[PDB]
């Protein structure tokens, strides 16, 4: 996250860190039930040196605050048994950039570990709405990850604006959230983590998945996120959640 602050301990108890074996933190995820996470499909692609699509290769840390303190009290460590990448995920565009991850055994709910609410299919997060992006990614473009989870406040951008800002790249599964003036943004390493939206009774719903962006924090380059309401039934279909 560029232009953010340290989260308080336990402030985003749905925020999960995914480590790939021997490589540390690679992507974010969100807790959504005792056995399921939402993340970005793009984190789970093989390359020639590492089968990022293979669930045995991963470790999920729930209730994590500090990457140097993964064994702190309240931190839960879990394996994955299954990665379901959206069948319509597009390599080149990042269309349908969403995955469901099944924990190998269930998360244990606590004040550090708690699921995020999922928005109904017809819910619309409106242009202008403040929401929060969290993660341990780069705190600058071309810059270094955070040890301590970062939070930054950003705003939903009008879809037409978003499409015009990033021509031939924005699909209706995508949503620009951030500032035309830059400053606050997600960045490399935040991928797969939740947008958190404070709703009408103060409960937090997931407004997106961190997906891609051009650099980070740049003027006229807001970060791009996979929408959630559109995938509500797909999630129900695949997880029971």
């Amino acid at each position: 996250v560029v232009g953010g602050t340290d989260a308080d301990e336990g402030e985003w108890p749905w925020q999960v860190s995914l480590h790939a074996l021997g490589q540390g933190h690679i992507c974010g995820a969100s807790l959504i039930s005792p056995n399921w996470l939402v993340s970005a499909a793009h984190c789970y692609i093989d390359d020639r040196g590492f089968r990022y699509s293979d669930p045995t290769q991963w470790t999920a840390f729930l209730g994590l605050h500090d990457q140097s303190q993964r064994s702190a009290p309240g931190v839960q460590e879990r394996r994955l048994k299954r990665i379901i990448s959206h069948p319509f995920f597009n390599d080149f565009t990042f269309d349908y950039d969403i995955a469901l991850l099944e924990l190998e055994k269930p998360a244990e709910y606590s004040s550090m570990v708690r699921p995020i609410c999922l928005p109904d299919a017809s819910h619309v997060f409106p242009a202008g709405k403040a929401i929060w992006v969290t993660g341990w990614g780069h705190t600058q473009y071309g810059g270094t990850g955070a040890l301590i989870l970062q939070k930054g406040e950003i705003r939903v951008i009008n879809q037409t604006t978003c499409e015009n800002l990033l021509p031939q790249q924005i699909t209706p599964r995508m949503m620009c959230v951030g500032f035309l003036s830059g400053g606050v943004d997600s960045c490399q390493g935040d991928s797969g983590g939740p947008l958190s939206s404070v709703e009408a009774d103060g409960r937090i719903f997931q407004a997106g998945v961190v997906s891609w962006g051009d650099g980070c924090a740049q003027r006229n380059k807001p970060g791009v996120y996979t929408r959630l309401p559109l995938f509500r039934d797909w999630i129900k279909e695949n997880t029971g959640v």
């Binding site: 336990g10 708690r114 699921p115 995020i116 609410c117 709703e199 103060g202 409960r203 937090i204 719903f205």
Partner: peptide, 4 residues
């Protein structure tokens, strides 16, 4: 879901 969604609180602390």
């Amino acid at each position: 879901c969604g609180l602390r």
